[PDB]
Amino acid sequence: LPQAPLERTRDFKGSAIRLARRLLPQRALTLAVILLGVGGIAIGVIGPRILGHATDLLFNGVIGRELPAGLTKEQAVEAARARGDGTFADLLSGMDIVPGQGVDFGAVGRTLALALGLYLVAALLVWVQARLLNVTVQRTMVALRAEVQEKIHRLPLSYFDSRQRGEVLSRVTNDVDNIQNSVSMTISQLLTSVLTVFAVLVMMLTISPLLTLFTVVTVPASLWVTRWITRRSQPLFVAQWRNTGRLAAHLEETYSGFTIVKTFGHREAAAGKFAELNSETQQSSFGAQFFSGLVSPATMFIGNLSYVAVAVVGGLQVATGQITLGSIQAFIQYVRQFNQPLTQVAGMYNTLQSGIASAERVFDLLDTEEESADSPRRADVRTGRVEFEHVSFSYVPGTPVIEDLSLVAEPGSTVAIVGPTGAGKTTLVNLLMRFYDVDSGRITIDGVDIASVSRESLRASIGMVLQDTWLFAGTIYDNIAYGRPDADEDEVIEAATAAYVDRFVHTLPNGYDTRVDDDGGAISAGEKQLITIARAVLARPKLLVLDEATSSVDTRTELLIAHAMAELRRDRTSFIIAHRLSTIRDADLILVMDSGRIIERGTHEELLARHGRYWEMTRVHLGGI
Amino acid sequence: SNMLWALLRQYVRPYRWLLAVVAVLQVISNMASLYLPTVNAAIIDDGVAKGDTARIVELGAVMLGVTALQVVCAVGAVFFGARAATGFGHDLRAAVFTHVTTFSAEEAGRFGAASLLTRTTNDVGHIQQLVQLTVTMLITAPIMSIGGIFMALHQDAGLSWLLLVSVPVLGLANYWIIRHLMPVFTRMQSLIDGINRVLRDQLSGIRVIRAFAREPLERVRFAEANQTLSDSALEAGRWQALMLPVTTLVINVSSVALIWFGGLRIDAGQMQVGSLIAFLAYFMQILMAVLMATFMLVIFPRAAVCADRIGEVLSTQTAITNPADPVRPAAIAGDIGVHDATFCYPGADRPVLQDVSFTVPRGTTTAVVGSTGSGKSTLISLICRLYDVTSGSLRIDGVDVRDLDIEQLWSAIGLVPQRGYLFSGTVAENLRYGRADATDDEMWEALRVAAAADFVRAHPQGLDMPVAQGGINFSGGQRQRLAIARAVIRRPAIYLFDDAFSALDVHTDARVRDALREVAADATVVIVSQRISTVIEADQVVVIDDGRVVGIGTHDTLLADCPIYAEFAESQAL
């Protein structure tokens, strides 16, 4: 049952046309679906007329048997009228009876045979139509999801930051399902429903227009009632959805921060707020769903009123001789069929609006400007000499972040960047990976420029270590092998041993099969960083950059890691960013950087010689202030 | 399955007279809907057939009364069916949340914070929708299929065998379809969320994906899942495409056979010709209701696995409880003592801690040091009794923690965990967790200490500046700096810092650790320290090392005696 409240569309018809053109390749399949639906609906609507003819023959025989034999119809009617029962004569007048003759079962049988054959064909065409419709829908959905994928992998790295906490997530996961529902409905149920209405109206017009009036008058009444119900329930759906989201947010905060809630004595207050929010969401759900379910009985009442009127007036007409009994049986079946789509017209309207507004969002996502086309050059970093030349960068036009710096990382040397929070270290190394584009500078790796280089081939040989560690919901072994998926189960373990992951792996019950998530599994943050280090070192890099790699690791395991990886990072440059002074020690080219610029550079001894910044910083780090 | 029925029988019992009222209202409504064809047949055979024209117009009143009863008996049914289902969902959600809130750290971590939210929010909605479209759509079949046959007996018993032949055959032909459709439907459901989680992982770790240049294989692994999902959907649709046409074919064949075998009897006079319309409508309504009820039957297992998860959540018994009649020490002053403690996490064969034993007197600072994975956070949790020591003793102010009011221990323990979590709202609301009634002059001082004052005072809203869902608007080092402020505002007798000083630059770290060393001059402070230069001022130092302690003393004595402390000092010398 539909419960999405409503959405606003910038342009309904343009988005609808684009969505229709999306399923354009399947033009032949779509045409075959439409034609099969039309044929099946025509054959299914013509059958009750055949049944009406059969029962008409039955009635003629049955009530012509009782009449005296020999006399003809128009004189038997006169004789009955002279008997005083004029209404029965009027009934006999509009009929095909031959007095004295019984029911001809041969004609009835050979008419029911035609009806059965038509019903077989109708029940055989609909199945084929549905089977073809499923294939068409699946093909279009596969194409749409594939191109959505491609667009996601082509989008700039700044689009995902502007979007608000899961907008992109809810734009591709649960927003394509709405498109699927709308597309699979608008050709399988809405089309049949409008064709049903049209064909039924045509046939009942061929039967009796006056009776058609009484059952077509209800369409405006049923539509008015349906739209009144939806208009009055619109404020309820929004309230229900908002309360559900609010309760979910409270539950997530209570569960994630459960330790804080328990420790600070807010357990009995969180329970009270839950007991006051769940009660509200229950009311807002009951009220929203009562009106939602009220639609079907409301329209069924109008349909039954039409049925009563049709039955009474048709009985009066047949008793008068205007139409035959079979023609009123067929009309009863026709009005019963016609009442059906009016019940869920609200359902189609709701599931069409919610889903065309989804296609609008998906198309807007697919129409956003993507990254510039990377020039294929197959970066060939041999030594690792990095050079920044007057590099300037601003996240947004206006306030700048990095202002005209120039560093020279010689091959083998391990440059160490330090500075206060917000200096832009992470931005400085992100510029090196071409996550963003340098505004008015130049980054050269081993002489060659970085702009005229295949971006994938550049990022595949740097092995960067995040500042904010990220792990997908899988096993530790899978997380480590995420670097090089084509590595056997003898290099992954070697890298884990090098990163000392295989020192606490032997502590868990199931060592390498431990399911670990990014939201606080059985692994602490310090041990979590080791998994990232192992993953980065598994995919053999040519120059390492580590942004706060060992922030939560003690200065006794990081020393072992450095000793173990001394051979690996022996002839490769490394940009180490850390707020901890004990990690940048024994590393030439210490860059103290503030406000985006570089205040001073040089080795540890030179920096200590010229008291200032670094000096003051190292005095503050140790005992003093 | 089995767990689902248990749930139902327990959590719908408060609403039995609502279900029993819906069951009667929908019986009356279905009977009224099936009775309209009966009075239509009465119009045909007692009116038109006999020529009476007043009989038709007088039976129109009966028809009108029946259709007026049918709408009220349906709008009364949809009201109570909703008031019962929403109430059942509300009660189940409340029970699940209440049970979860009693879990300790270990039980909560067994399921996970993310998985528990789904358990308490979506798997209750699935059972609620099952209840709703069972009390409104499933039960339509057992009354329709029975009352229709009953009215057929009441109308023409000599021909009602058609309903006893057609209903079972349609039921069998639909059961054979659904028994094949259910497993592939479950597989498609288990693939939909799989591709959803694939997309979620791709979007969350987009920076990781681009940094490792995994796009060419990420596309392959997404395509191999999209194609599999499409194939499963096609397989499940080629079965679903048989549900409607088979029902329509059965209806039409039954109609044809009805006309034939009805003409056979009407020619002999055993039945009036008017009953054909009534039987046609009976067949249509009954065989449509059966198909519509079997449509909902597809998702039983989807609501059964959810019920199994909810039952496994509800069946877990908490271990850390509040002792009966606990000792109540007025004005609990911090004085900790650990005697031969050992945790030995579930998942045994390696106890995390072993024979830990030391003492922290009141007003003295004790700093615990050790490599990653040593168990410092486990010791901190044991101090505040997030867990319970299995084979040791942990006594605060002489009295053991295990027999003590847990809330009183909570109230004066000043915990600053390693994680760092800020609830939604304003900074003032987050700081009010420490003291429920804190003045702005006191909040600014507490804020000021943690050196967090001059990044919220520079905000236009000041103390009322908004905070994200989990403090995600902060950068890290501001969130866990506000975490320090929200505990220093408590002014507790015990401070328990769990290394919340990471992600802080040198100046801010020094400022914070020098300012909080003043406000905590007279307080039992246990700080998980990493930098040796910040341990000289500590009154006592503990040398946890991958299990037990390997040294106890001050800075100089531990440097002289303990070799691991000497290794730490040498390695972070310069």
Ligand SMILES: Nc1ncnc2c1ncn2[C@@H]1O[C@H](COP(=O)(O)OP(=O)(O)NP(=O)(O)O)[C@@H](O)[C@H]1O
């Ligand atoms: N996505 C972004 N959009 C806009 N501004 C940003 C973004 N990321 C960072 N900044 C700003 O860039 C400046 C420095 O960014 P950042 O790269 O995080 O420095 P940082 O040295 O890494 N800070 P930290 O890592 O905590 O020591 C700050 O003024 C940030 O607010």
Ligand SMILES: Nc1ncnc2c1ncn2[C@@H]1O[C@H](COP(=O)(O)OP(=O)(O)NP(=O)(O)O)[C@@H](O)[C@H]1O
């Ligand atoms: N739920 C759990 N199940 C099994 N092992 C666990 C669990 N939680 C923690 N451990 C292990 O217990 C040991 C102690 O962990 P922990 O106390 O977090 O270390 P730590 O003192 O916090 N070191 P650090 O990571 O720098 O904070 C580690 O070997 C963990 O892997």
Ligand SMILES: [Mg+2]
């Ligand atoms: Mg950063």
Ligand SMILES: [Mg+2]
């Ligand atoms: Mg820890």
